[PDB]
Amino acid sequence: NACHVPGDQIFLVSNSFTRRLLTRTDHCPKCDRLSTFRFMSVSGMVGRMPYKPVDTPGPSYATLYWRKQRSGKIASQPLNEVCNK
Amino acid sequence: RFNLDEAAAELQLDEAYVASLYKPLHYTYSMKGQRYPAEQGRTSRPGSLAASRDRMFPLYRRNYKLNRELRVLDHRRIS
Amino acid sequence: FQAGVHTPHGSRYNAARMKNWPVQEVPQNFNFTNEQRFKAKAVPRDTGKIPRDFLLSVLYRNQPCEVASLWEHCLHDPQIVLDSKRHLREVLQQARAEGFVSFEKDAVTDRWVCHLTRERFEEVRALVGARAEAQDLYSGLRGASATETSAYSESFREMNEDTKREHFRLLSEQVADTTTHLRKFQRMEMDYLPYTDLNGKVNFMWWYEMSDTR
Amino acid sequence: TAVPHEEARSRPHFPAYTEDVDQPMVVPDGVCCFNCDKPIDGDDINSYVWVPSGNARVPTTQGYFFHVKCFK
Amino acid sequence: RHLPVMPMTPRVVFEHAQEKRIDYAKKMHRDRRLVEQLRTHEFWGWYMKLQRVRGRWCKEHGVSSRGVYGPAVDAAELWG
Amino acid sequence: RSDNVAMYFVEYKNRDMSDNHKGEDYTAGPERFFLPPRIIETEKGIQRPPHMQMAFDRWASKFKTEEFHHWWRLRHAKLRYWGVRNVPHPSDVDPLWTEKEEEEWHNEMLANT
Amino acid sequence: AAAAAAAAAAAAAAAAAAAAAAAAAAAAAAAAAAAAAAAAAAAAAAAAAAAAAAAAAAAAAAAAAAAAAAAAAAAAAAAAAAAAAAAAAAAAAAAAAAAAAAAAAAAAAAAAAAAAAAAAAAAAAAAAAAAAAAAAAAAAAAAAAAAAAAAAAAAAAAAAAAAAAAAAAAAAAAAAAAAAAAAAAAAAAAAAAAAAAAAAAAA
RNA sequence: AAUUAUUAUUAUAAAUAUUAUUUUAAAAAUAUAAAAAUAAAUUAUAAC
DSSP: OBOOSSOOBOOOOOTTOOTTTSOOEEEOSSSSOEEEOOOOOOOOOSSOBTTBOTTSSOOOHHHHHHHTTTTOOTTTOOSSOOSOO | OOOHHHHHHHHOSOHHHHTGGGSOTTSSSSOOOOOOTTTTOOOOOSSSOOOOTTTSOGGGSOOHHHHHHHTOOOSTTOO | OOSSSSSOTTOOOSSOOOTTOOOOOOOTTOOOOTTTTTTOOOOOOOOSHHHHHHHHHHHHHOSSOOHHHHHHTTTSSSSOOOOSSHHHHHHHHHHHHTTSBOOEEOSSSOSEEOOBOTTTHHHHHHHHHHHHTTTTTTOSSTTSOSHHHHTTTTHHHHHHHHSHHHHHHHHTTHHHHHHHHHHTTOEEEEEEEEEEOTTOOEEEEEEEEEEOOO | OOOSSSOOOSSSSSOSSOOOOSSOOOOOSSOOOTTTOOOOOOSSOSSEEEEOOSSOOSSTTOOEEEETTSOO | OOOOOOOOOTTHHHHHHHHHHHHHHHHHHHHTTTHHHHHHHHHHHHHHHHHHHHHHHHTTTTOOSSOSSOTHHHHTSSOO | OOSOOOOOOOOOSOOSSOSSSTTBOOSSOOSSSSSOOOBOTTOSSOOOOSSTTTTTTTTTTSTTSHHHHHHHTHHHHHHHHTTOTTOOOSSSOOOSSOSGGGGGTSTTOOSOO | OHHHHSSSOOHHHHHHSOOOOSSSOOSHHHHSSOTTTOOOOOOOOOOOTHHHHTTTTTTTTOOOSOOSSSHHHHHTTSOSSOSOTTTTTHHHHHHHHHHTTTOOOOEESSSEEOTTGGGOTHHHHHHHTTTHHHHHHHHHHTTTTTTTHHHHHHTTTTHHHHTTSSHHHHHHHHHHTTGGGTOOSSHHHHHHHHHHTTTTTOO
């Protein structure tokens, strides 16, 4: 969704927060920086759509391709943990 | 707090250049733009004193010097 | 975390407990409804700089590491910054996009094996070293004489020549079994406060301290 | 792309800022001005032009790089 | 024979000035992006101090910023 | 008066056990809108939170510069051109925040230094 | 205007409505807007000899029919990376840079192709001459690494048994540098004994 | 363009400044604009 050189992160679309949509500086996941993340992928809506169910926004295609690749491998870390605590 | 002047020492430009970037480009240079006709200043009434938009907005005065170095080249640079 | 909310009663770890959080005694016959466990949302754990380096420290002592030894090693430290086996799974998802860990499985076996990536292993030694630069110096009995270290200063070179793992059969448990007596003497408290960064996202700020429980 | 049978974009034939997470498109660490051989700043300056082609030539992402006064 | 000098024909003094207003129009657009960082960078730097003076003031006054409920509700590993 | 719209005065109820407005008063506003507002005279040296001022002192000290004054006066020129009556000429316009004027607020200014 | 009007503004909207002209910004609504607004300058097409280097190689591998639309397919197959700066038109820039400078002439049979290489098949021989046997040399210089990258483990096959025998070196002290403040004196001495009960008999 | 009005007067140069004008507590017609049906973008719709 928002990606720069170091790491990645997940955000959302608080309609007040638009001037951060394209390029929001952020503390990078890696060691340290106030990296200037850009906008990579849509990830759906904050509030619902009038008389439209919660699934009408839709995150993105590549965002599905993201968590299925960023997280993705729950079969690779079913060690020490599964969906439970 | 962030201070432009104490910042320009990190950029070495000057005081009067960092500011011109953070106010419209008719308050420093010689481009086209109209201020507001109340800011133009008045005469001296029987009651009130005089005014002048160099005594009312000393910061908004055109920096005709800084225009010399940046946007207009000399005649002794191309001789 | 509680006695038997999500995992049946008897699943307690000798780990860094959270501050102020009591062991709320859940009665024995209690059970969830399978449709109550539907949502089952829980508290997000701190996966930051303190746990990561800590996570690497135990992955740095063991460049390969397997399933259970992933958590079975965190018990072998003076200071731990985990509370559960899910707090171990949590940071690992972080440490992958940190390029710190690219763990795999050996084809001849059928277990998943840790490995600090070689695109970052040379530098993470400083990160485990910046923890280590005062990890040895702050020790107390080290600095009380010389005959305790001098009764051992010569073994480190003669161990790994002809008695290498001979000592490692003890260097795992006996040198760490006292930390279990110490885990009952000094845990760490994952004191936390929630907040929001100016982008708006929610996150916490964790003030880690050792519990002087005694 | 091999979008199944010419199922690409209708009005512009291309969308804006299609999700770039697949390839990070990061500037190199070792770099050179393709014509003047000058090291180039990473990502906070406009004084370098990236030429990201389908192919890859110059540095490590290998889209060409000039200095803004080195393209002549 | 002397070194070559193409005179200042009105065209070449027209390009010599173009070459100047460009870098100026670039320099502005350059260090419009330089103090921009020093402002944003110092903002968050000031802010991370704010959440930390806020923090170690709450840890001293019982203000847990967590809801009316006690800590036991967060111990449950449930939202509820 | 601009549009005959009835003005309501919404407010939060319990403000005695509050933290940051434990003893504030809202009969009329402060002297210049960037000061800590009036307080109930029984609680003068009452300790407000130490951070809800760091977002105030950081803020109430942008209206103290000469450039803001050149905004405050310019804003009049904008208005009389924009037709708003009753806006006195930008010539005779008192500055918002001066130096000597501040000492009166520098009176109760001996908390931490 | 429904997308703008509906209260909860979506995510697509916030990215669509943006037509700003700052760096790394919405390019469509920067393109869509006025020609006085766009600084969307000309697409830097590479006509490098490098673009000749991934040209004279391929044809001598497959010089048949229809090499003008599925020629880019080769560019989508033969991929260390493609060749066309813009697959769309740079691959159509490939023949004109080839047709000019007297390098490649077309071939037309039921359709137009890029065959016959235009009498420069000698400079295609000594192009591939500078290919495999250039790729051959550089992949073994990293094998010089990989003749000692075996040793990279081997130089620390002992050290990872050594400096994990150093990982106790401090802990053994710190195991008892905290025992000091709990005072076993029996589990304390033996934990220092059972270590030194076999430490001096080693070597 | 009668104006402090439908308006980037743009020959040129350009790219991460939140750089500073838009009232109202009701109802219809109209005006813009809008979930569902007789592989595509369309309908008509004088429907929320």
